[PDB]
Symmetry: C3
Subunit: 135 residues, 3 copies
């Protein structure tokens, strides 16, 4: 069979790994992006201000990883939004909507028991490397 | 590179979006289906009767989304079953089994802290558009 | 369109199914592996010793499923690590690192409310059937 391209995506514009994972893996045309917390890329510390600020930073981090792979938010096809508190659903929704301005991904959003570093939100994503033709 | 097909799947036979997501995204041949709660498509209210009734409605909803994409349950390759209570595992298993009557998908099933709308179960799925040849 | 290969992966070297799922599904070149607990393949009982021993057994189980599909850990592109306790993150990380000795997968790791069988850890994975060419 054909040898499919598998590339580790890595950018200093997103946080360093806090463990045994890659920021994202591109395989064939699919990009699996690791769960992102609202961590500042330079410090690796959660940004202050709680879930809204954290959600913004997490999505900014995903954006930088997408850019490293020659993609943007239009390439995302599935997202998972993990919350520390289900009462934050509406607030996070309003943040998320600002990044996906068409062809909204499939998703799931729900509350887990706890995230690393005491994070209030973690977002995972799957993207597909372009070009994509959307009818 | 080739421009891959990316299509938003949308049917009025499944619940309207309660937020910034598509019911499903078809990209190349893979269909990412959003997490479905046991919501009535017409009202958008959770069906009464608790987890068993909700599980049935959620799977019915996935079925309608699959149909919109020219697929059925035989096309599902991976499911995720999110529970509000791990004690409901056996009950949900018995519901789920009635929809997948061969070539059972890969899966994960476990308890989360909370689902949207106070749901007792949420099911996500990945399918692949046919034809599929199963040896 | 072409008829894509869909194959159920099954090995007696990994635990029997405790419900309506396949150990893994290969579709085209992507392998979706079901969530694995730290269950002994012969008995179907969780191994003693808590999360570290369970994590080792779960990863051993994934390894046997990969082998059945003609793959190994180098083929894994995304993992999900579900914990019963976020305080176990560092311990599980140290176990996991021993299995992935290059080209680390994308991942997400976090605490859920409860796993089947009172498990302390469950690991899901996505792999891509080789050959893969890593630059």
């Amino acid at each position: 069979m054909s040898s499919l391209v598998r590339r580790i995506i890595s950018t200093a514009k997103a946080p360093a790994a806090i463990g045994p994972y890659s920021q994202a893996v591109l395989v064939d045309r699919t990009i699996y992006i690791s769960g992102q917390l609202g961590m500042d890329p330079a410090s690796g510390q959660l940004v202050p201000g709680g879930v809204v600020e954290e959600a913004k930073q997490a999505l900014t981090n995903i954006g930088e990883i997408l850019k490293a792979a020659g993609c943007d938010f239009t390439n995302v096809v599935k997202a998972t939004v993990l919350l520390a508190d289900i009462n934050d659903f509406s607030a996070v929704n309003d943040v998320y909507k600002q990044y996906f301005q068409s062809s909204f991904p499939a998703w799931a959003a729900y509350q887990v028991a706890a995230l690393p570093k005491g994070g209030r939100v973690e977002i995972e994503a799957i993207a597909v490397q372009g070009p994509l033709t959307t009818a």
